């Protein structure tokens, strides 16, 4: 048995006395000497039991392994290697019965005395999970609990390190909330960042410009690099936002009115990157039945539709109008007679340069609004941009064919 032979004379760091981790590798690939933890790797391994048993899976084709995190639980034996595992090196493993992917394990799937061990070819092993919307990678030093996932609207108890990107930054450990970051001037990616933050899991934060205060520019901090931003936030504890299964139609109306007033304030302050998810949360509020007296079902839906309006407004302000299409399409799905909503959707269409559907909905809005000139001038601009794309192709396509004749001798 190859595994048995390698196991001999191996210094082992063991969790228990007779169960643990066994330094066993054959050759060592050159790699970063410093230990690093990486979620993203394409490791090559050969899962063979050997030793009088046979592993028929993963032995054949080397499989890249999706490491969930530094403490990934998909395969227990897999992380054990990552203990004191370098990047771009080679590694080999040994049997641990407890460490079986299917929980405790069953004898036919996993031999009772032997797990799956692999002659790992270690590859780049640095970094943690990234951000699907970019700007941050998981930079932690503690573990989550799975019990307490902060939720939108839960006012939090976070502490702050005191130095962003290499610069002592000016702030305090204030009761943050998703709709509060823009008010007190710190990296605003905090909103979607604290998601991966629970109770008692320390996690420093890399910040990209388009995610936090980076792209927004700093008159108070004194930061040179807007993209190189790193600092630690200490979420000591936090309350819980009252959610769907948690709120009630009366409190629904309460927080609905309060946010609607807040929305006017957001418009007055002009800040909207906060407003995206709070308007989204009002949307989700109403997107379910209330089973209560709704004499003003129209008034509720009107709050919702004005939210649609300002959502599309901000999507016009900065965004690429896809989420504008989303919000105002929900609007049309509810109230399509919006004096301004569908108007801004068609205006996006023209700024999307789709001036034909713009022709359609613009004549529609002119039906409902024969009063103002904005939409009529906008559809005129649709005709202008159509003619501009016309002259575009005209230029780029003058006897385009004759050019082929030039090639002919």
């Amino acid at each position: 048995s190859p595994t048995a032979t390698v196991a001999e004379q191996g210094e082992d760091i063991t969790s228990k006395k007779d169960r643990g981790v066994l330094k066993i590798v054959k050759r060592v690939g050159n790699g970063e000497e410093t230990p690093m933890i990486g979620d993203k790797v394409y490791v090559h391994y050969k899962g063979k039991l050997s030793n009088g048993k046979k592993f028929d899976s993963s032995h054949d084709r080397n499989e890249p392994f999706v490491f969930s995190l530094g403490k990934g639980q998909v395969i227990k034996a897999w992380d054990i290697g990552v203990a004191t595992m370098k990047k771009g090196e080679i590694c080999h493993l040994l049997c641990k019965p407890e460490y079986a992917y299917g929980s405790a394990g069953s004898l036919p799937k996993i031999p009772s005395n032997a797990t799956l061990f692999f002659e790992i070819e270690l590859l780049d092993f640095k970094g943690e999970d990234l951000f699907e919307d970019g700007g941050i990678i998981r930079r932690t030093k503690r573990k989550g609990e799975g019990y307490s996932n902060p939720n939108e609207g839960a006012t939090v108890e976070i502490h702050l390190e005191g130095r962003c990107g290499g610069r002592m930054f000016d702030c305090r450990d204030v009761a943050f909330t998703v709709g509060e970051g823009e008010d007190h001037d710190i990296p605003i990616g905090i909103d979607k960042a604290l998601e991966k933050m629970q109770r008692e899991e320390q996690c420093i934060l890399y910040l990209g410009p388009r995610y936090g205060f980076g792209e927004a520019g700093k008159p108070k901090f004194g930061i040179e690099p807007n993209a190189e931003l790193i600092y630690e936030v200490t979420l000591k504890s936090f309350e819980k936002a009252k959610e769907s299964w948690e709120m009630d139609t009366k409190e629904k109306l309460e927080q609905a009115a309060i946010v609607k007033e807040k929305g006017t304030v957001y418009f007055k302050g002009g800040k909207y990157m906060q407003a995206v998810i709070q308007y989204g949360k009002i949307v989700s509020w109403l997107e379910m039945e209330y089973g209560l007296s709704e004499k003003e079902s129209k008034a509720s839906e009107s709050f919702l539709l004005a939210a649609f309006l300002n959502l599309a407004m901000c999507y016009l302000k900065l965004r690429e109008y896809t989420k504008a299409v989303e919000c105002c399409d929900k609007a049309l799905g509810l109230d399509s007679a919006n004096e301004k909503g569908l108007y801004r959707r068609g205006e996006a269409q023209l700024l999307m340069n789709e001036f034909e559907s713009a022709k359609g909905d613009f004549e529609k809005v002119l039906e409902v609004n024969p009063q103002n000139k904005a939409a009529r001038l906008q559809i005129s601009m649709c005709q202008k941009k159509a003619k501009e794309h016309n002259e575009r192709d005209r230029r780029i396509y003058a006897n385009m064919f004759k050019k082929f004749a030039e090639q002919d001798a």
């Binding site: 899976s57 299917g102 004898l107 036919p108 799937k109």
Partner: protein, 343 residues
């Protein structure tokens, strides 16, 4: 949980409505034939199971029994109308033996692998008939005279069915023309005295020759009995061989008895196009003999050899070389010979 009415939709499946809400519990016996199937159709019925919907009790009932229970794809085996479930069966000691198989946990189904070849049928292209394709294309006088064979054969066959039609239309036959550039006679022949049908075949032969048809212009239309002016042939072109022209002269004779039965033509035409004409074959070198059929069948081989451009020459040969009998096969040779008794 209270259990609803015990009505059954499924072998072990019985849908009951709990006190509204509902749940069905189709059981997998651990020693059955389709026990693997039921332990897996569970997953199919548990395709629509929510993100937290299988908290299987996992002591000796396996952890994996409801680990890959959650779905991967949407193929719709039976239904997709399921939300929640639970592994409820014999909880303790349900088998004196179960290997706890534990083999290949993440394979899926290959769409049932139903791809067997549904039985095929071909079609008979029938957009054309005779007078249409005739003006459309003029074939080789042998490619044409072969079409004549398909006519008289059914003409032979239909009167062999005792049935009779007095005057078949010019286009009474329809042309398959199934492969492009080659016409064909209807097998069904739905459209409709002895030798009457044969006379119609002789008359439409002129149309194939493209020569003027006397039964039409000159007169005596629609009557096999009618005969005048010695059955003149206004066939001036020599494209048609003089030997077969002698057979045409023999056609439309003073008497229907001296006229040939459609088999005689079939005979003639079997003998004429197939077989072979040689100086050694000359002088009625063929006499009473049975094996010569095979020897003649060999002389008909070269239809594939010479002028087999139009591929159809091989198609019907099988149904023709097989069915022959010297009883009605020697006389035409005698009458063919007359082509050479020309002297």
């Amino acid at each position: 949980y209270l259990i609803g009415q015990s009505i059954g939709k499924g072998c072990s499946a019985a849908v009951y409505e709990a006190t509204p809400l509902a749940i069905k519990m189709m059981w997998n016996i651990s020693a059955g034939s389709s026990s693997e199937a039921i332990l897996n159709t569970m997953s199919q019925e548990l395709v629509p199971a929510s993100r937290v919907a299988l908290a299987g009790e996992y002591g000796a009932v396996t952890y994996r029994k409801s680990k890959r229970g959650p779905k991967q794809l949407a193929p719709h085996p039976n239904i997709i109308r399921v939300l929640r479930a639970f592994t409820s069966s014999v909880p303790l000691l349900p088998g004196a033996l179960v290997d706890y198989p534990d083999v290949l946990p993440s394979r899926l189904h290959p769409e049932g692998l139903g791809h067997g070849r549904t039985l095929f049928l071909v079609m008979k292209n029938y957009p054309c008939t005779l007078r249409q394709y005739l003006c459309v294309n003029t074939p080789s006088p042998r490619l044409a005279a072969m079409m004549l064979l398909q006519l008289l054969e059914g003409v032979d066959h239909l009167v062999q069915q005792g049935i009779a039609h007095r005057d078949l239309k010019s286009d009474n036959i329809l042309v398959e023309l199934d492969p492009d550039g080659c016409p064909w006679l209807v097998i069904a022949d739905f459209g409709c005295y002895s030798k009457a049908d044969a006379w119609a075949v002789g008359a439409i032969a002129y149309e194939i020759f493209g020569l003027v048809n006397p039964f039409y212009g000159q007169g005596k239309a629609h009557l096999e009995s009618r005969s005048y002016q010695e059955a003149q042939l206004p066939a001036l072109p020599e494209s048609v061989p003089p030997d077969v022209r002698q057979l045409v002269r023999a056609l439309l004779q003073r008497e229907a008895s001296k006229r040939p039965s459609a088999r005689v033509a079939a005979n003639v035409l079997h003998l004429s196009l197939w077989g072979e004409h040689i100086l050694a074959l000359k002088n009625l070198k063929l006499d009473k003999m049975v094996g010569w059929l095979l020897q003649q069948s060999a002389a008909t081989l070269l239809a594939n050899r010479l002028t087999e451009k139009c591929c159809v020459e091989t198609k019907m040969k099988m149904l023709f070389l097989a069915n022959l009998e010297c009883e009605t096969l020697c006389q035409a040779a005698l009458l063919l010979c007359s082509w050479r008794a020309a002297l």
